[PDB]
Amino acid sequence: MSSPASWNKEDFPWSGKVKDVLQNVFKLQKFRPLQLETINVTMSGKEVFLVMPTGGGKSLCYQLPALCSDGFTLVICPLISLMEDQLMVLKQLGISATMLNASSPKEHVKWVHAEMVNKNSKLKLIYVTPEKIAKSKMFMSRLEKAYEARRFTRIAVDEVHCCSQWGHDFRPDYKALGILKRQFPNASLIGLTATATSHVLKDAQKILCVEKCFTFTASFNRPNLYYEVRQKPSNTEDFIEDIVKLINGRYKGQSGIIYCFSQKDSEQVTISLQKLGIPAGAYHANMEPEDKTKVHRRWAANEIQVVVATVAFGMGIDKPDVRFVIHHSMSKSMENYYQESGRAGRDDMKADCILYYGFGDIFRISSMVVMENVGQQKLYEMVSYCQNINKCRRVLIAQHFDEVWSPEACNKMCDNCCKEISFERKNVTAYCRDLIKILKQAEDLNEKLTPLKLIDSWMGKGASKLRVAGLAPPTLPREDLEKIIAHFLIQQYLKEDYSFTAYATISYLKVGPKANLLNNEAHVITMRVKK
Amino acid sequence: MSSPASWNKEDFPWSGKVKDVLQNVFKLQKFRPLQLETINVTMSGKEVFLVMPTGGGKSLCYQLPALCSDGFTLVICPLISLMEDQLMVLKQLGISATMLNASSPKEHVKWVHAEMVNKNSKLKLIYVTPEKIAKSKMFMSRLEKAYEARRFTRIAVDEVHCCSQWGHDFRPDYKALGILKRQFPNASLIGLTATATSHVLKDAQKILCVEKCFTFTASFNRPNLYYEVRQKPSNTEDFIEDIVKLINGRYKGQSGIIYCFSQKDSEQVTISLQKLGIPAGAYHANMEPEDKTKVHRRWAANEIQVVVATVAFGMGIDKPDVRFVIHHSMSKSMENYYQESGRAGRDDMKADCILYYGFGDIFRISSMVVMENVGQQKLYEMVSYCQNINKCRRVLIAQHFDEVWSPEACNKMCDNCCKEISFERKNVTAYCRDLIKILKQAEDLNEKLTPLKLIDSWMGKGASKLRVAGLAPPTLPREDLEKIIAHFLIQQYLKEDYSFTAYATISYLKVGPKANLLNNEAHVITMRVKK
DNA sequence: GGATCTCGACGCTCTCCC
DNA sequence: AGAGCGTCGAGATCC
Numbered sequence A, B: 001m002s003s004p005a006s007w008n009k010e011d012f013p014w015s016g017k018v019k020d021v022l023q024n025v026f027k028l029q030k031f032r033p034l035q036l037e038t039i040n041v042t043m044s045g046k047e048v049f050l051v052m053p054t055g056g057g058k059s060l061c062y063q064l065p066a067l068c069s070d071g072f073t074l075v076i077c078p079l080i081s082l083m084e085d086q087l088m089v090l091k092q093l094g095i096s097a098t099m100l101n102a103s104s105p106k107e108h109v110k111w112v113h114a115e116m117v118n119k120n121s122k123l124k125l126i127y128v129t130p131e132k133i134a135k136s137k138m139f140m141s142r143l144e145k146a147y148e149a150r151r152f153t154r155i156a157v158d159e160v161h162c163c164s165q166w167g168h169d170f171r172p173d174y175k176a177l178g179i180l181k182r183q184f185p186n187a188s189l190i191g192l193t194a195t196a197t198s199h200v201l202k203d204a205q206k207i208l209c210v211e212k213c214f215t216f217t218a219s220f221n222r223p224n225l226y227y228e229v230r231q232k233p234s235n236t237e238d239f240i241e242d243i244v245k246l247i248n249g250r251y252k253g254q255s256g257i258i259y260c261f262s263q264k265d266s267e268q269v270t271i272s273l274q275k276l277g278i279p280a281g282a283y284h285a286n287m288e289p290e291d292k293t294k295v296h297r298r299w300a301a302n303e304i305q306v307v308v309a310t311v312a313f314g315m316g317i318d319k320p321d322v323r324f325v326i327h328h329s330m331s332k333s334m335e336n337y338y339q340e341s342g343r344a345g346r347d348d349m350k351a352d353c354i355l356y357y358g359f360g361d362i363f364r365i366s367s368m369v370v371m372e373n374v375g376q377q378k379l380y381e382m383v384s385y386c387q388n389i390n391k392c393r394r395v396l397i398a399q400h401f402d403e404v405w406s407p408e409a410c411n412k413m414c415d416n417c418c419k420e421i422s423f424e425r426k427n428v429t430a431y432c433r434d435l436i437k438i439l440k441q442a443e444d445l446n447e448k449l450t451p452l453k454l455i456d457s458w459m460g461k462g463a464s465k466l467r468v469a470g471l472a473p474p475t476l477p478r479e480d481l482e483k484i485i486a487h488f489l490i491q492q493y494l495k496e497d498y499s500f501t502a503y504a505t506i507s508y509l510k511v512g513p514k515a516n517l518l519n520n521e522a523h524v525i526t527m528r529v530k531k
Numbered sequence C: 001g002g003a004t005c006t007c008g009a010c011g012c013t014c015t016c017c018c
Numbered sequence D: 001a002g003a004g005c006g007t008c009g010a011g012a013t014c015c
């Protein structure tokens, strides 16, 4: 909500030191957007909140000032693997930093305690969990004693959106960080986040007891990324063959990421690509630091070409020259797909974001997110993105980023913008009636229909007992019928029915709520068909 | 082959009449190469043999002299279809000509007989079968009467290669044709042919008793023709879709020819092209004269865009502005492909020769040509042409016309010459060992394998009984495997085994004779692939 | 008559998250 | 336990 352009100077007393720590210590060349302004706000002793996408370079905005200020910097991070992620790079660069989780032994805990009060303990960044602030009586004590000794000067809050309710990813410990700025007022506070709306940001400002605060948000639009949606072949081996052909065609030798829904799927793709001559490796977030360094250094040294990652996992893979991100299966939500695909083309040059749309993936993910009360809705948003053939994909993604998406032209940088066929709207009402006929007949016979059984009964296949008498199967291929059934699902003419078995959660199809709209013979249902 | 440059007039006693008949009677502008010289040797009262490709314009070389001399010219034609074709061309032009076969009615025979001795008879060309000469005494008597009356002066023997028992199909009746030059020595004889085969050319000089005569042959190389080979999709509808796409992309509005292997194939192809918006028309040599005129007037007036014909013996389509000849299936032989594709670009301008190579076409045609003792070898030459991706197609075709093909540079007039692909010899011996393992096991389980069954067992598909225990299916697509199997068949590492059923001939695959060449470890089977 | 493609019925496999 | 997949037998179509 603030204008960072006024802070994009280098004439501050600290700008020389900042530039060198960036070039000779951090081994970087020039600042990414909003980094210099955020750093300049922090070095001036003011609080600042930075909203910036994952993989953008948010961490530097507090790591570099910690090396330009005196003493140490406290970093509130909620999860331990994420900490170790930062710590690896931190003292791989030669920056003495440390960690405090619940499970650290007494040796290290007392060493850290003595180092906070030490005068040239070379330590510059202490990462701690919010429980260490909320539920540790005297961690606060020597925090205050280091403050009085001018050693405690900066606070960095990761995932600041976790402070506010009417928000998601709420960690309750985040209430108690309001003590920090209350007890440490001269210490400058910086909060960083990638998923935050201003309505939540202001609540977090109130919660942290930071009223006057700058708010910089980055342009989430990445014009160098090309968004594309491709059909997912039902055969897994044909799918891997198509992936290998695409990689060898467009991205021969270029580094890339392949996102899979499951860990089994990612291991699966790693070995399959390896057998077909594409050097690949797997990466896991709940990983040992060392094998993280292993997969990372094999990727950087181009020893392997493609990194196979899991959806809610990646969280630390960071390569500037990622030329393509292939989604082996669609993501749980549109925001998740944005943050996942966006890790590509961090060098601001052209990169491709390919997504493979599979009919069965819809119901796998739907069956997986049943416990999330909004999982199905966000998944249907993703499915509607995959089904859309006319709108520019950048606009579709922008629909979920109203506050952080600059209204910029796509410049023919997505498959729909380049697709030079205009479309026409087919009346699909007959197909909906036929599907409802099938579903009601299966309901009468006490039979539950999986999407596959519904499709087969529609095509005159599957169990003869489940077929409606005299229903002529449509003249369209399986894929088109799948898109039609998906469309009916989104418009809620059909609805999902989850059944919980001892082994897994199965998703059947049932007549939807809006189906009664068909009682109107004048009711028309329209779809947009390729030419 | 004689030197025709000395016969390149314009100063002969008949050159005025020749030019007048060419421009005012035949409505032509300029002589095609070797037309002038041949007509001149004929008008000087000498015998001549003309070798010119199908569609070159050979008929004029005997039609024009008959219109400059007095009386009529006898034309020996083996088949009735070519007779009706020439009768069309002559009757439209207002040139009175007639034909007399065994199946001609009584009064028509009487009419021709009375017309021969008639002095004021407007008849200029009498087409007859060699049986009319061999097995008709009354016809020979009328020929004698006309010869002595100075009305019969010229003899034209079409498809003269039929005299020889070495050329393409030999007619026994043609053996008797040697009586003509024996009974009418002052009558000038011209023999026409498209298959040069100079052994055959010395023959039927022997048979016709014309051994001392001029023999002109044309340059078979057509530099304006671009030779290309494309892949035939296994699905027939994708096949027709590709044909429509090619025509609408490259050849909007241009006249074209589509050669099909089977009659029903050509019919189907017309109907499917019409359904897709390409005005098409079918043509068969054994057609009524009226509908042949129908199809030709629809083609000339651009009322139909493409003409689909089956590869029979007797395709007189003969249109000057044929911009593309697409072979829906490969041809039985290389010479056949040349003669068929050569109908393109008769105006000496650029024209395309598209060839659709299908794996199953090999075995249709091999099953069809089992009685021709050399049919399989020539079909394999065709297959070797289709498989070749490096050598210039012009050189490959010219290898079969060594005496009549001038060694001229292609100048990027074929698909392989224009592509700038570097090539690499891949070792494929392991694939041959695997295939031989499969076929040998199928012999062990005492079963015969069709090409489809062998390729399926190679890919781990089809009947489990026919699968090799430990054979891993190759990582290449099915079509690449079709390419490998075709290469092994051509090189005789595999062989065909025909089985005769009550309604068709099946083609199975068995271990080939050269397979034993693998006893040596140093034996390598290389295949040239893109790099 | 045999290959080739469908249908259908029976046995078998597997059970998708971070 | 249920859904889905692979495999084989029986029927239909074609030459």
Ligand SMILES: Nc1ncnc2c1ncn2[C@@H]1O[C@H](COP(=O)(O)OP(=O)(O)O)[C@@H](O)[C@H]1O
Residues within 6 Å of the ligand: A028, A029, A030, A031, A032, A035, A052, A053, A054, A055, A056, A057, A058, A059, A060, A318
């Ligand atoms: N100014 C910059 N120039 C070049 N690379 C940068 C810059 N800032 C950050 N990076 C790189 O981006 C990668 C990911 O940044 P990170 O700090 O993880 O951002 P976030 O915390 O938003 O995920 C890091 O490996 C870092 O080396």
Ligand SMILES: Nc1ncnc2c1ncn2[C@@H]1O[C@H](COP(=O)(O)OP(=O)(O)O)[C@@H](O)[C@H]1O
Residues within 6 Å of the ligand: B028, B029, B030, B031, B032, B035, B052, B053, B054, B055, B056, B057, B058, B059, B060, B316, B318, B319
């Ligand atoms: N000199 C020429 N100029 C223009 N067209 C010609 C010439 N000679 C022949 N043609 C045309 O070529 C077509 C086919 O020739 P044709 O006599 O059938 O040769 P062939 O007997 O070798 O098939 C004829 O329709 C004719 O009109």
Ligand SMILES: [K+]
Residues within 6 Å of the ligand: A006, A007
């Ligand atoms: K300022």
Ligand SMILES: [K+]
Residues within 6 Å of the ligand: A226, A352
């Ligand atoms: K692209």
Ligand SMILES: [K+]
Residues within 6 Å of the ligand: B226, B352
């Ligand atoms: K061309």
Ligand SMILES: [K+]
Residues within 6 Å of the ligand: B394, B395, B398, B406, B407, B408, B409, B410
């Ligand atoms: K040549």
Ligand SMILES: [K+]
Residues within 6 Å of the ligand: B359, B360, B451, B452
């Ligand atoms: K095949």
Ligand SMILES: [K+]
Residues within 6 Å of the ligand: B363, B367, B450, B505, B506, B507, B508
């Ligand atoms: K066959």
Ligand SMILES: [K+]
Residues within 6 Å of the ligand: A461, C006, C007
């Ligand atoms: K079926």
Ligand SMILES: [Mg+2]
Residues within 6 Å of the ligand: A053, A054, A055, A056, A058, A194
């Ligand atoms: Mg981040």
Ligand SMILES: [Mg+2]
Residues within 6 Å of the ligand: B053, B054, B055, B058, B194
């Ligand atoms: Mg001819």
Ligand SMILES: [Zn+2]
Residues within 6 Å of the ligand: A391, A392, A393, A394, A395, A410, A411, A412, A413, A414, A415, A416, A417
């Ligand atoms: Zn766009």
Ligand SMILES: [Zn+2]
Residues within 6 Å of the ligand: B392, B393, B394, B395, B410, B411, B412, B413, B414, B415, B416, B417
């Ligand atoms: Zn060439």
